[PDB]
Amino acid sequence: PQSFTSIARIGDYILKSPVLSKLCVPVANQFINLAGYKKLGLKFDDLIAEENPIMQTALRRLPEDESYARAYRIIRAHQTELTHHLLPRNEWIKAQEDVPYLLPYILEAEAAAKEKDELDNIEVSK
Amino acid sequence: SSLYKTFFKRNAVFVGTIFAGAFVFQTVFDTAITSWYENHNKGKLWKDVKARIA
Amino acid sequence: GPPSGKTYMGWWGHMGGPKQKGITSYAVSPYAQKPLQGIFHNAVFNSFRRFKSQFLYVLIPAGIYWYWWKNGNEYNEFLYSKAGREELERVNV
Amino acid sequence: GPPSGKTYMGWWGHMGGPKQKGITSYAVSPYAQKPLQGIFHNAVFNSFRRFKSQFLYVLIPAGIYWYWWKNGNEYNEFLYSKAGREELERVNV
Amino acid sequence: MTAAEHGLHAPAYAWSHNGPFETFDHASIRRGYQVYREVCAACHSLDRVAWRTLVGVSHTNEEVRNMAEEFEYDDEPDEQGNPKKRPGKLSDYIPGPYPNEQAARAANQGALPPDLSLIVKARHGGCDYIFSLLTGYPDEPPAGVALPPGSNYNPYFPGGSIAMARVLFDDMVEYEDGTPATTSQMAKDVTTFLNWCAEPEHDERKRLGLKTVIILSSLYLLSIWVKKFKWAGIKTRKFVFNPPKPRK
Amino acid sequence: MAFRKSNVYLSLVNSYIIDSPQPSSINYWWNMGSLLGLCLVIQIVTGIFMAMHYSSNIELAFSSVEHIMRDVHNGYILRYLHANGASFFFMVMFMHMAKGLYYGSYRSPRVTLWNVGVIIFILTIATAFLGYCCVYGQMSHWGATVITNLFSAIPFVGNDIVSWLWGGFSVSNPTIQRFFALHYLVPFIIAAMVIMHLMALHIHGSSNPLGITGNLDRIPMHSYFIFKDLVTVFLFMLILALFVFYSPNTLGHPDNYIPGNPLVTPASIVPEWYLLPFYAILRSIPDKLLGVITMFAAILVLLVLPFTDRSVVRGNTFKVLSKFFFFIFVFNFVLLGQIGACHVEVPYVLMGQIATFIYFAYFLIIVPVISTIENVLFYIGRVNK
Amino acid sequence: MAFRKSNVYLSLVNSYIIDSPQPSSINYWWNMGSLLGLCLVIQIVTGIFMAMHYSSNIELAFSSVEHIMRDVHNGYILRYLHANGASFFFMVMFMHMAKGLYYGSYRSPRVTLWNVGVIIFILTIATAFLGYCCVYGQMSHWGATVITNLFSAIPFVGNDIVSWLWGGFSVSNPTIQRFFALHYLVPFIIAAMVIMHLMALHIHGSSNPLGITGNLDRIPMHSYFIFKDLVTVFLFMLILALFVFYSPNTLGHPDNYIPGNPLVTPASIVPEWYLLPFYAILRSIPDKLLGVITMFAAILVLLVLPFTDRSVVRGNTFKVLSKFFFFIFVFNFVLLGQIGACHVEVPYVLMGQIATFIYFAYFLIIVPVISTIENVLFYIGRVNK
Ligand SMILES: CCCCCCCCCCC(=O)OC[C@H](COP(=O)(O)OC[C@H](O)COP(=O)(O)OC[C@@H](COC(=O)CC)OC(=O)CCC)OC(=O)CCCCCCCC
Ligand SMILES: CCCCCCCCCCCCCCCCCC(=O)OC[C@H](COP(=O)(O)OCCN)OC(=O)CCCCCCCCCCCCC
Ligand code: HEM
Ligand code: HEM
Ligand code: HEM
Ligand code: HEM
Ligand code: HEM
Ligand SMILES: COc1c(O)c(C)c(C/C=C(\C)CC/C=C(\C)CC/C=C(/C)CC/C=C(\C)CC/C=C(\C)CCC=C(C)C)c(O)c1OC
Ligand SMILES: COc1c(O)c(C)c(C/C=C(\C)CC/C=C(\C)CC/C=C(\C)CC/C=C(\C)CC/C=C(/C)CCC=C(C)C)c(O)c1OC
Ligand SMILES: CCCCCCCCCCCCCCC(=O)O[C@H](COC(=O)CCCCCCCCCCCC)COP(=O)(O)O
Ligand SMILES: CCCCCCCCCCCCCCCCCC(=O)O[C@H](COC(=O)CCCCCC)COP(=O)(O)OCCN
Ligand SMILES: CCCCCCCCCCCCCCCCCC(=O)O[C@H](COC(=O)CCCCCC)COP(=O)(O)OCCN
Ligand SMILES: CCCCCCCCCCCCCC(=O)O[C@H](COC(=O)CCCCCCCCCCC)COP(=O)(O)O
Predict the structure, then answer these.
(1) Which one of A102, E179, F140, G2 has the minimum C-beta count within 10 Å?
(2) DSSP of E166-202, one letter per residue?
(3) Are F147 and A90 in contact (CB under 8 A)?
């Protein structure tokens, strides 16, 4: 309920600022490995809750080859959590494979439903 | 062994051993826990105080 | 019967997850493996690993609040003494 | 939800009757016709035709039993009279 | 609240019925009814204890049929409707010493003495307080404390001022079995007896608990095993993923 | 097909306790749902067998509870199972709404599950208060006075609801007689609201502690979570069996064995422990009208939680900052229970006002700010630009 | 889709009372199910508001029914709406078990619906009896003495069951005080067996008075049978209001206003008027052990009715002989409700033995014989050979 168009507006203002990118990006990746979702073998866009129609849409537009890997890292995390273990250190998602692979499919299916609500609510002048 | 064929094979005789094994567990475990509880408290019960009234 | 709305869980066969392919799962019968094979080395070595991660979130929220409680429950017994009645008559007044 | 058994009633659309074809069903709105259009001549002439059919199925089961109850309740009151104590001594014992 | 208005903390004595496997001392209840009758039956009712519960706990069957026939209860009236009395039986309760509440207040300078059926469960401390109340009376109260006329001091009562005077003095009763009746020996014996009167199940509540904790913790180690048995096919599942042919 | 799916009644048993697809990775915190179902039956089966000996008049209320504990065979078992099995109702239920806060089980599509949760939580606070008032001890009489005198602060309709609840002018024989016939009833409203609570759960299934979809790896309920729920049934029946047989009057109050006397106030007039953190909220507002509202808005602030959780991932499992501030709240609910059992003295009158603000700024300030800083830190930690 | 279909709760309301396709030919006998749902809420709501004033001891039972009728505002309304409404429960239900016995609603595929009927009928007999013994009148003490002494006929387990059932050695304070907490409860078991009775109906739908398939012409429930039920709701409310305000003690016995005295027996102990047929079956057998069985067999002989009806046509609508012999059974059932009121006198013992043979030879002898003759006459009337 945050709407990724919004956090990409606050995020890309932080990345472009040279003062804030020196300051709070080292806090950002320290927050990531402390969160510990890589240790179960998950990229971050596996975690985004998939029960709203703006994100259930962007899971159909995903290609077939990435929607088979994503259906494996979830079952590899359901299996690792019910043994109450962690994945071994040669199976953790590294810092470079953690890519926003579902961000462009969300941002194009979120800004195409913001546009639908700016078209049921137009007050056209005479 | 052949313990499986006589006891655990037919469920009609498996659960008939649970009930015949609980009928012995009721009578024995209750007597074994009463005869310990009074023996641990020897000298405080009324059956001993009635013996001091001589 | 009557229909119902869309859900996010179906039943066995049409559960409604994504189509999966090329993921194969092996499992052995539990009559053929020893249950509780690893009670030791998990109650000792794995239970420390779980306790090392999630204890610093259950000690500092209980170290902030228990130091706060013990610094007031000790303050309450000061002003209700013979030594702190002159501080009591200005706080309630 | 799980699939259930085979029942003899469905819902709107797949009710499970026989396939019907060539049955036209004209009907007028109730706002355009008069209710209570025939409340008289149905309370007199129709309600006599219903009574004419189903009354020998109610009266003869109540003309066998009410005659049976009354012919015992007046024999019970004969035995407990002054005139029927010489008969009560031979049937109560 | 001030420590004076809270009462002194009654300490932790070593009672013979503490612990989980111990029962009451039934020679300390039989010596603890005698201190109830000869000392505090003057001004304390015991209105929830029937005479039949003393049978087999601390007195025999003939010792209670000769203790209930000392008092007198209301029989059903005679064939002219006059009220009449009868000697007591085993199905009656222990009679209080005052007929109503106002007779109780008039005899003890306004203060109604509480009924001692549940007095150990209804006080903060249990029997550690009822014992230490009775032996907690100083010879003279501390300096500066102004007692009202007709109120005794002991610190273990909440407030400091109590209405009961110091009642247990040495050798005021003579026990049947030849026990030295001191102030601490008598105060231990009623406090066991008043503990019995509020908890007549304490012998059998603690031995039904021995049956239950033994069963319901050997039903818990067994149910851990059958969980680990039935979940062995899931906790050792193995997934391998080789990605399919991308031409499809 | 199978008979367990073809019968009209067994298809409800099959789809709920036998073939219900549960996610495979749910831990032991999901056993609190089956514990509350067991702990509701204990409060009903030992309620009927205890209401066959209970006379509800005000002169025979407290004397019939002692008739249960002294005269009825195994009456000490039946009452102590009922007084300690009701404290264990509110300890499993407090660990069931804390699993819900932690693992994000209030978010969509399960908002209609959270809302029937707060309705069942209200009808159980109501039932444990009516049943406490049926014993008519000195904490049970004087507890009914202070609670039902709060409704005399409703503007212009105040004194006519209070004098309608009491059935008179104070807590009397019309009150205890109606607080028993009401208290007998409401567990047959809870037992019909739990059926309205399993229905809202069954359309979307249980969540799971990762906050990702569980539609991929499901396992059935029968022979997998039957025997996992049987581990904590036999543990709940073990920590109950220490608090019934070996230490039964530890959770209760000692003053409740003094009979109900309306002419003497006790020293500290305090309801039973679980209603304590809703008593340091009521007592911290220095006003009578707002103190009733703030106590009633301490349960209805649980409804703004689906709309104030701004996190885009579900649950606190993979979050650092919103996992610390959860336990700040949980050890604030405990402190708020302790301020409710201390006297109205300095500095507890200030502790109870800060620790009420933290109860009402978790749901309205701390959650919708920390779960926004986390959504930005997940984004800018990976997206290099 | 519509919100009445898309919600988890409202689709249970939608599929049962709004969109449920009822056959478009059902007459006014199909309203007795909707009346019993209303007549159950009347007993339950006028049970809660009456049990806030009722003390259940043997000393304060009859004195606190009169406290309701004299001291409570509109208390005479509650006690009379609920003592007469319970006698209107059994008159609507006897017309509900006789619609289904006439129109063939017991036959397959509705044997599951019929068996939950006999289970609801047994709990309703047991509910209305257990509340009758709560007034502690003279007919209710000696009603409970005569009924619960029938279980002293079971061999070697007789006296231990009765002395467990009385809770003592005779009908005393623990019997009346447990006949209230039971009688409070069993309505909530009837209110759950009714939900288990609509589920058995909803899978195959209602029948129709012709006995043919009703899948062709179906009209909804909303605004058609909602407003066909509001006719008979407002009529049942009218005939109840005559029997509550204008003649309230017509149905009950006059001896129930004597306070119950175990030392003086009344002239003739009878139950309330609806248990009077089964009391005449119990009294007909000159043996005590067979009487308890046959009075219980007379409710369980309704279960052999789906297997003894040998007709290929559903219901008695188009049958000459099986419509005549049905009304002999109904007016035999009224006669058994009359021999139950007379004393044990000549000739009401030869009548009560013959008119209990016709109760049992209807299901076992008459219905299989006259429905085989009603199938050869349907056949050889049309086939020409
Ligand atoms: C006072 C009133 C209470 C009334 C309610 C009675 C029931 C209380 C239950 C509390 C609870 O549910 O906590 C569960 C907690 C988290 O579970 P998890 O899935 O994250 O851990 C996986 C485990 O290895 C499964 O291991 P596994 O399933 O293979 O073995 C069974 C396990 C069962 O243990 C329990 O049920 C909890 C005691 O056997 C044992 O290891 C016991 C050996 C003596 O279990 C844990 O392992 C503890 C982790 C820290 C939590 C601290 C709890 C403090 C409140
Ligand atoms: C009206 C509103 C009601 C609100 C309720 C108020 C709070 C009631 C108190 C209930 C206590 C419940 C504690 C929270 C339980 C749910 C949270 C939980 O399950 O803990 C799990 C947590 C970490 O587990 P993970 O799920 O993150 O593991 C995945 C690893 N990759 O594991 C941990 O971090 C440790 C868990 C330790 C639990 C500590 C409980 C403290 C109990 C209070 C003690 C009071 C006396 C001091
Ligand atoms: C073995 C002897 C006795 C025992 C165990 C005993 C027990 C008790 C107890 C437990 C209390 C309650 C104190 C409290 O509420 O904190 C009490 C109070 C009282 N007792 Fe005693 N009692 C004894 C002897 C007596 C006697 C002989 C009298 C005669 C006058 C007496 C008069 C009172 C009164 C008036 C109170 C009420 C005091 C108050 O409420 O302030 N007691 N007693
Ligand atoms: C969710 C359900 C219930 C809860 C949480 C609950 C809780 C309580 C509590 C806390 C008490 C006070 C016990 C004490 O302090 O002495 C009590 C008393 C009582 N309850 Fe319940 N109760 C529940 C259901 C029932 C039911 C269904 C009955 C059915 C008759 C019942 C009958 C009683 C009776 C008769 C008492 C007074 C006797 C006693 O206190 O032991 N309760 N209840
Ligand atoms: C009588 C009280 C209750 C009963 C019998 C009950 C029953 C259940 C059961 C059986 C489950 C499924 C097991 C599980 O998911 O843990 C469940 C889940 C749940 N309950 Fe309760 N519940 C009760 C009270 C509550 C309350 C008071 C709340 C919240 C205020 C609540 C909120 C939830 C939620 C959110 C879930 C879903 C958790 C998830 O699936 O992730 N329940 N309930
Ligand atoms: C199917 C539902 C019910 C039926 C058939 C039923 C029937 C009866 C009957 C026949 C009586 C005796 C009336 C008399 O002779 O004066 C009675 C009395 C009574 N019933 Fe019910 N009842 C039902 C439900 C309830 C419920 C749900 C409650 C309580 C919550 C209740 C509480 C009482 C009470 C308190 C009496 C008091 C005695 C009196 O004033 O009549 N009943 N009931
Ligand atoms: C509290 C008592 C009862 C309630 C609330 C109840 C409820 C209902 C309702 C609402 C219907 C649908 C309306 C109708 O078909 O008339 C129905 C149908 C039926 N009921 Fe009941 N019922 C009760 C007792 C009984 C009993 C005692 C029997 C039989 C022994 C019974 C047998 C049937 C049958 C056979 C039907 C289906 C008739 C048909 O639709 O063809 N019910 N019930
Ligand atoms: C097949 O189509 C149908 C059909 O689907 C249905 C539902 C019905 C209707 C039948 C029913 C509704 C029967 C169901 C009956 C119940 C479920 C009984 C439940 C009744 C109750 C009254 C529940 C109990 C709840 C209370 C008593 C709460 C009231 C609160 C009280 C008394 C306390 C008041 C205290 C204060 C402080 C206000 C039909 O008649 C019908 O055929 C047309
Ligand atoms: C989602 O998957 C599920 C799930 O589907 C379910 C159902 C449960 C289990 C939850 C429950 C069972 C809660 C529901 C609770 C109820 C419906 C309460 C029911 C209890 C009653 C209605 C009261 C019981 C009353 C009786 C049995 C009447 C008999 C009692 C007495 C005293 C009669 C005495 C008389 C004589 C003559 C002896 C889960 O835990 C669960 O997660 C695994
Ligand atoms: C719950 C136990 C069973 C009770 C049996 C009652 C069955 C009949 C229920 C009648 C409800 C009528 C609502 C229909 C409706 O709203 O249609 C509404 C409008 O109907 C009306 O305006 C009717 C006027 C109000 C009638 C008031 C009746 C109250 C009497 C209550 C007696 C029963 C408790 C929609 O009708 P439409 O779709 O044709 O436009
Ligand atoms: C708290 C209840 C609230 C509502 C929830 C409903 C959940 C109910 C769960 C009950 C589980 C136990 C029910 C088992 C019954 C299965 C037997 C059965 O259905 O066979 C039924 C017959 O049922 C009966 O005769 C009596 C049922 C009374 C049940 C009283 C408890 C026949 O089954 P069948 O579908 O094959 O019918 C063939 C038609 N000739
Ligand atoms: C034994 C079972 C007893 C009978 C239980 C089944 C029959 C119950 C009938 C209940 C009818 C009244 C319920 C109407 C409420 C519908 C509103 C609704 O569902 O909205 C729910 C939210 O519900 C709640 O918050 C509280 C509901 C508690 C109900 C307490 C009575 C939202 O519904 P939804 O998820 O479809 O939202 C779509 C977004 N536009
Ligand atoms: C029906 C709700 C009852 C739930 C009880 C759960 C609370 C645990 C404490 C129980 C103590 C009461 C029993 C007792 O005192 O026995 C005591 C023995 O302890 C036990 O056996 C406890 C075993 C519990 C097994 C749980 C299975 C429940 C199946 C229910 C099927 C209807 C005394 O037994 P005794 O009178 O000496 O024969």
Answers:
(1) G2
(2) P---TTSS--TT-----HHHHHHHHHHHHHHHH-TTH
(3) no
